Amino acid sequence: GSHMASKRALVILAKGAEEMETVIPVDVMRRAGIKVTVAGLAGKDPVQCSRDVVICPDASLEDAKKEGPYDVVVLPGGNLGAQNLSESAAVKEILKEQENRKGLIAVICAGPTALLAHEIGFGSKVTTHPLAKDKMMNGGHYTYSENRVEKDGLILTSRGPGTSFEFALAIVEALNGKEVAAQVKAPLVLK
């Protein structure tokens, strides 16, 4: 078929998610032509984020989970967002399936602690927000990195709001290649 990759992303949006860490990847991936489904963890109703920005999901996770599999599953950070994701059986199942099928998992900031909660990617080199380091490293199930973006095979992690553009472009690069990522980067006026 076509040499032009048509890819799909699942972004899981929980109450208390960091809104910048949600919107930057969604926007940047859509700029790349990735079909992104913003899926509300609890359901389809609008989601109150960490600084009270309210984002309306495209669908409930309930419904979006049925339209899998996805080329990447994306978890934003935010302490409460990460907590909610960590407590979710539905999220456990999706991550496990994604890992089982050798699909990309991309998580940022406090997000990676959801990987810890769900026993996903043990033994990976991972980064997190500096403040989430101890939580992530409790039990020594990973090797820690200070890299702004870290990609260890199909486990892609990043550090904070300030690494969100780099994180999103790394996802684009992994799904669609370097040239597509360069195209999307070009008008962003990034440093």
Footprint of a second copy (CB under 8 A): 18-20, 23-24, 26-27, 30-31, 38, 46, 50-56, 129-131, 148, 159-163, 165, 187-191
d(CA 46, CA 58): 10
Sign (positive/negative) of CA torsion 25, 30, 35, 36?
A: positive
Considering 3, 49, 109, 118, which one is annotated as catalytic? 109
Query: Least distance (Å) from a second copy to the CB of residue 189?
Result: 3
d(CA 96, CA 102): 10
Query: Least distance (Å) from a second copy to the CB of residue 47?
Result: 9
Nearer Cβ to a second copy (51/178) = 51
Nearer Cβ to a second copy (5/56) = 56
Q: Is there a contact between 80 and 50 (Cβ–Cβ < 8 Å)?
A: yes
Q: Which two tokens stand for residue 41?
A: 């963890």
d(CA 177, CA 77): 25
Written as one letter, the residue type at 56 is C
Q: Is there a contact between 156 and 25 (Cβ–Cβ < 8 Å)?
A: no
Query: Least distance (Å) from a second copy to the CB of residue 97?
Result: 26
Whether 141 is catalytic: no
Q: Which two tokens stand for residue 185?
A: 């980067």
Q: Which two tokens stand for residue 14?
A: 């929980």
In sequence order, which residues have a C-beta less than 8 Å from that of residue 4 and are 6 or more positions away? Answer: none
Query: Least distance (Å) from a second copy to the CB of residue 83?
Result: 18
Query: Least distance (Å) from a second copy to the CB of residue 45?
Result: 10
Considering 49, 56, 118, 129, which one is annotated as catalytic? 129
d(CA 82, CA 153): 22
Whether 109 is catalytic: yes
The residues annotated as belonging to the active site are 109, 129
